[PDB]
């Protein structure tokens, strides 16, 4: 039954830890984001992560990447009012450090001070 290791969003998560805290291994999932997602999923916050069933790890993932569908208040999100299109996003896993290392290069292309100083230090 109990599984000592699990894998989701291409990240490893160990079962021995409280579910709310275990999830924070994923880039972009902080303590508060993790806490609210669990409540919306109505999982038992006091369970340890290795106890959850597959159809409970789904729904969780299905919320983390669609937060606006469950009326999380948008002011909770880390990519409000995107520069290209005015959508609100939350950035997860390897997608973080791809929008980073992109806005830095976008500044470099336009010869802005902040871009210049950054790459000059490198």
């Amino acid at each position: 039954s109990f599984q000592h290791i699990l894998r989701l969003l291409n990240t490893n998560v160990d079962g021995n830890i409280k579910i709310v805290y275990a999830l924070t291994t994923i880039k972009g999932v902080g303590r508060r984001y993790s806490n609210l997602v669990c409540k919306k999923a109505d999982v038992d916050l006091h369970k340890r992560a290795g106890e959850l069933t597959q159809e409970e790890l789904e729904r969780i993932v299905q919320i983390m990447q669609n937060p606006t569908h469950y009326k999380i208040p948008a002011w909770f999100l880390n990519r409000q009012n995107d520069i290209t299109d005015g959508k609100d996003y939350h950035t997860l896993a390897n997608n973080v450090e791809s929008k980073l290392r992109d806005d830095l290069e976008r500044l470099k292309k336009i010869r802005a001070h902040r871009g210049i100083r950054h790459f000059w230090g490198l």
């Binding site: 109990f2 021995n16 340890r48 290795g50 106890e51």
Partner: protein, 69 residues
């Protein structure tokens, strides 16, 4: 090694026979000579006291003191 955080049937059987042996029991004692994590020990004491196997003398959240009787 790591302390256990979920209760297997073997340790449950172990707890019920071993704990009545000790003069003094506390969170620290169960974590030491048994190998459960601290979050189990807080649950075990409330259960064993309710069940009547150990006798309280004082309770303080940050300390607890139970005796053989």
């Amino acid at each position: 090694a790591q302390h256990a955080v979920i209760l297997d049937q073997e340790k449950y059987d172990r707890i019920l026979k071993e704990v009545p042996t000790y003069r003094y029991v506390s969170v620290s004692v169960l974590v030491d000579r048994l190998k459960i994590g601290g979050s189990l020990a807080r649950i075990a004491l409330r259960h064993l006291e309710k069940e009547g196997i150990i006798k309280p003398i004082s309770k303080h959240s940050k300390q607890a003191i139970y005796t053989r009787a």
